[PDB]
A paper describes a structure:
The riboflavin biosynthetic pathway is well-studied with dedicated enzymes to perform complex chemical transformations, with the exception of an unknown phosphatase that catalyzes the dephosphorylation of ARAPDP, the product of RibD, to generate 5-amino-6-ribitylamino-pyrimidinedione (ARAPD), the substrate for lumazine synthase. Using an anaerobic activity-based screen, two phosphatases from Aquifex aeolicus were identified that dephosphorylate ARAPDP, but only one reconstitutes riboflavin production in a one-pot experiment with the other four enzymes of riboflavin biosynthesis.
IMP is reported as an IMP, which is a member of the phosphodiesterase family of enzymes and shares significant homology to the putative target for lithium therapy as a mood stabilizer. Inositol monophosphatases are reported to fold as a α/β/α/β/α penta-layered sandwich that assemble as homodimers. In addition, the estimated molecular weight in solution was that of a dimer as determined by preparative gel filtration chromatography during purification. Density was observed in the active site for metal ions, but no metals were added during purification or crystallization; therefore, these ions were derived from the heterologous enzyme production in E. coli. Inductively coupled plasma mass spectrometry (ICPMS) was used to unambiguously determine that magnesium is bound to the protein. Whereas reported myo-inositol phosphatase structures have three metals modeled in the active site, the electron density in the IMP active site only supported modeling of two magnesium ions.
Residue numbers in the entry:
A (entry chain A): 3 to 262
B (entry chain B): 3 to 263
Write the structure that this text describes.
């Protein structure tokens, strides 16, 4: 029952990804709009989102689509798509090629289908409930490691955050002291996929929106990973994820400094 | 006479890079030695270093070569090569493909030639004093931006550090508040090249060794960047680098928390 949703997710992610490909390296300061204090958006994000939404609604006209840049369209369906048309906008504008398109479907409150496309590397991560997780048609799974000194952890948190920065610096410092490496690549959907692929053992990302994480959560769960979502799923949330050992370790650190 | 040194630097970087390409994804826990409190090394790092050194000394048998993993070879020379046979070891072992081979030459105390090879992406950054900086034979230059909110800054510092972690957290937080983005990719030589290429406006990396930075400093300077080295150049140093605007900003932040001389 999920296969058609999954193939459409992938096509929609590719459709937005093509916009990203055609414009990579072309976005000048003249084209950047400010959102809030530190966020940027351009015609690239918005055009990608238009294309993704169009694809999804042509196949599933009664579905709801929720995108970062232009909001929601639909009439109240239990099938809700959460779309980040450009995850890694700052990286994209700078020419740092860690950026993605994220297309995730939830049924009620359960994430069931995900596709995350990295256009610069032509790498498509995908997965659906009960069907497994894949990158370009190779099956993927989280790494088995439980040794903290061998673990790698990806992290992110915003500047000008809702929480005091000290909370994130304290969680960071305690995890940093124990693990082999910590990396901050700047695209949360890609971080989830790299845990799912078995590159990083754990991840902690703060102040996420549902389009940041929905597709990656499907892929992570199908890869055997586990996660904890702190806060409101349809609002601003925090994600702690990994294999079982690193999820548990990061969560126990975070609990000293914030309620989870 | 820099052209012959430069072409050899590139060949040596490729020679080590080929060892990295052949073994990427193959290093198991069995193969990993622990160096200090948190550092790893494997047969891959050491084989890459052997190949790089062999190339350099076949062409320049009287030069000095200094590698991270097996130290120095030579008999005293004005010409000293500083080699990181695998910059980004932890990334490499994990399968995160941001890693490089760094091959830099100093004449006395002046860096004069650099090559940094990213084997996964087959991207060779190279430069020499007065000859420019290049990536795969396209000329490169640092970005012009002076707007902090548009700037991107790459950073790194170690998890068992000589300085108290609070110093690095304080410098980080003050730069983070003002700039558009901060990124931690995990390979200092690659960070220097990404500033040289015009991707990131600035960089701050703490507790570096000379093989981490020599090649990248040549490339950065030929790209029009500027840098400040804090500490002993032939010892453990810190680097603050960027275009002029971001170098100055990051340096002014760091001065609040550490002596930058
Ligand atoms: Mg976005
Ligand atoms: Mg996002
Ligand atoms: Mg090294
Ligand atoms: Mg190094």
């Amino acid at each position: 029952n999920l296969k058609k949703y999954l193939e459409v997710a992938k096509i929609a992610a590719l459709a937005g990804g093509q916009v990203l490909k055609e414009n990579f390296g072309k976005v000048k300061k003249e084209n950047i709009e400010e959102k809030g204090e530190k966020d940027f958006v351009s015609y690239v994000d918005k055009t990608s989102e238009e294309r993704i939404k169009e694809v999804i609604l042509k196949f599933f006209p009664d579905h709801e689509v929720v995108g970062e840049e232009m909001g929601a369209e639909g009439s109240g369906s239990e099938y809700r798509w959460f779309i980040d048309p450009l995850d890694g906008t700052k990286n994209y504008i700078n020419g740092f090629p860690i950026f993605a398109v994220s297309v995730g479907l939830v049924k009620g409150e359960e994430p069931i289908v995900g596709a995350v496309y990295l256009p610069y590397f032509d790498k498509l991560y995908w997965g659906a409930k009960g069907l497994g997780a894949y990158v370009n048609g190779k099956r993927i799974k989280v790494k088995d490691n439980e040794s903290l000194k061998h673990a790698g952890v990806v992290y992110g948190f915003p500047s000008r955050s809702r929480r005091d920065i000290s909370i994130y610096l304290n969680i960071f410092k305690d995890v940093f002291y124990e693990v082999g490496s910590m990396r901050r690549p700047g695209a949360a959907a890609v971080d989830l996929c790299m845990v799912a692929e078995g590159i990083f053992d754990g991840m902690m990302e703060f102040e996420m929106k549902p389009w940041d994480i929905t597709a990656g959560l499907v892929i992570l769960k199908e890869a055997g990973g586990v996660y904890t979502l702190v806060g409101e799923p349809f609002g601003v949330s925090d994600i702690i994820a990994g294999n079982k050992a690193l999820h548990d370790f990061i969560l126990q650190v975070a609990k000293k400094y914030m309620e989870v």
